[PDB]
Design a protein around this ligand. Sequence first.
Ligand SMILES: [Ca+2]
Ligand SMILES: [Ca+2]
Ligand SMILES: [Ca+2]
Length: 821
Amino acid sequence: VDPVALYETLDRATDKGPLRPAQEAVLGDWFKNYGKRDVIIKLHTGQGKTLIGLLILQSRLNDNRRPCVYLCPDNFLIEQTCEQASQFGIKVSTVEDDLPDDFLAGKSILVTSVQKLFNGLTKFGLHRQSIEIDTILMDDAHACSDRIRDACKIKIPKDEPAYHALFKLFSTELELQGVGTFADLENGKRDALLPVPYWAWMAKEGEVAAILSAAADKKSIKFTWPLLKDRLRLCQCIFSGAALEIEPHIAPLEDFGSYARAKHRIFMSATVTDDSFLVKGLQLSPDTISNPLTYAKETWSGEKMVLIPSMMHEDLDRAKIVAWLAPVNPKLKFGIVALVPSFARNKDWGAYGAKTVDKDSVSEAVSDLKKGQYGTPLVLANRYDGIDLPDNTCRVLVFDSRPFSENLTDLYQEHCRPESEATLMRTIRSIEQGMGRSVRGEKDYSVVVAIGADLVRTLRDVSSRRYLSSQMATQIEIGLEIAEMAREEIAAGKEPLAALVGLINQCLKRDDGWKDFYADQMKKVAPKGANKEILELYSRELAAEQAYAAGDYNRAEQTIQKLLDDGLAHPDDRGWYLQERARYLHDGNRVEAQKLQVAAHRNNKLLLKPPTGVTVTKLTIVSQGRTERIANWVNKFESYADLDATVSDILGRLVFGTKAEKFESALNELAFALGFAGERPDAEWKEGPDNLWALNDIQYLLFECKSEVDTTRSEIHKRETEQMNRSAAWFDKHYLGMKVKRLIVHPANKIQSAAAFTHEVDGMLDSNLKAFVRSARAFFKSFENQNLKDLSVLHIQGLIDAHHLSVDNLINRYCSKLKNV
Ligand SMILES: [Ca+2]
Ligand SMILES: [Ca+2]
Ligand SMILES: [Ca+2]
């Protein structure tokens, strides 16, 4: 009954000692207070999660409270859990073919992956047929939440016939949400993304149901269709040239009666990771999130030296660190592990000799590093959960660039809501999960080198710093202080790479001064609770979604309206909730639905465009006061470090070979940065140019962004010329009387024989765009050692005249004449 007393009665191995104080305190707190239906245990990594879970579930089994089940997010953790249970003398069983009879009889703890429980053809049963479970414990609840989310999604790749069937079904309504993006979809670009709107989705529920039912024999639909077959009106559909994803807004956790009707639910997660995501992912009340079971005497655990070399010198960019750490070095006595956001960035690390591994070969490479194969650096792409690197297995973890999600839904919300709460919290959660893998013990120490301009912007931005955990924020601040001190050292004549190597040596050689400095500085961490406003916002969102799922549209609409009126929503994030009301009222009251959809499109133009009632508004700016706008935009920043981080992020993305979406967003941000006003009519107004800059009252810059085109291509295809002709026609239709410089951002100079331009269009080659980026970087570098809040207007005008960023300079200096073949 008592788990601390139960620990002594086990036939444990000889090398297993007594309970740690944190483990014993958590067990005592659990036995005293729960011996409430939901509970979250937050603790540091390496505290013995498996031991605590097995002890709690064995104690629950001892009271004839059966069955009790431990879930792992993956199969490696299944093997580790069963091995450790064999060490501790606790009998466990696994689901080989069918459910164990000992598990049903309540004789042993069931250890299973979260995929076995959460799937459409599960052996635990669905709806009323679900096999009853008393106590269920979840380890690493955020990874399990991600796996539960991925189990409820339909992803159909291009090569299946279902993708072409659904594309033929939805081509008419996908074309109205963007014309250039539709041409990218027809060519199969992975980066291309188009949503199917709600009005087309509920009106074509039967056809999509028939198409998906016709392809139930495929692997991608067989295990997901029974959950979604009777709730297609609640889903959303996103198309990309590699795959199409259909996902419900909230996961159907009510169908899983073994989990939803469970008598006790214990959740385990990291201390640094914010448990605000569990409101929607796992459908918890905020009371359990705001009241976790933690060790009272618990402090910071483990040693992390989070270095940011981009703060140290201008030469210490991402490329220098990549060229320094990637190539093989046989004299190293420890592993070097790099975390990159995609397989595209495996090229830069792997060109120097680093070992790049795919999804299936991560575990083999990690196990090889655990055996002492420290010669070759290891690169891991977009997978941080489930990886353990204790002690000598990794002493140099490298974090490359801002991590991005593989889900089309999250990419779409990143496209529409860049500065919202949820997107920033997801990115910060991914950053913290990736950064905490290198340290697993209370003694273990590591250097985490975080590079890439976008990652540093995420770590510096004032809106994004407030969501970081206090431990990780204080570690970043220690890195900032050491970076400033070593910057002063480099200003005294020290070589930058030499200073970085010296600091890494100070951490790795166990210097006493660094230990004293870390012990003194770390004392400032106050363990932050979950933010109550964000929890209340998510609770209202979940309540409205459940109200709409039950057929009560008016309750959901009033819930979203009360959410808007109480001020919990961000002022720039109003329009999303307006769209939510417009989607909830679509069946009930179509006129009010169209009114709120038009309101949502006016408030946030990146959202879905209704076919009627939207009028194109001319982007207008005044000629005078450009320098005042530049001064105000720079005046938003507190110090030169934030401005340099933001400018380096924006101008790093203006290179060929990057994604088209990132290039267009960076160009719009640079439009605002230079005192202009920019818009993206293909994404905002769903037709026309990819970017438009309002330089002054009468002059505009029109861009046709072709960033994905390889630099070695020497001809302009017919489809690109047709796209630029359509953009020019749209601008001549909606902006009569305005001068414009039509620019096509393309590496090629020559035009194909079958292709032609209807208007005068000039190209931006690679050298011209590089010169433009150099001019912008030299312009924003000139604000160094200047007072940001007292910028002189004449000084800014002089900098504009010096760096060739005037209106005529933008029109004429940064373009090249194209040649016809
Ligand atoms: Ca386009
Ligand atoms: Ca675009
Ligand atoms: Ca394109």
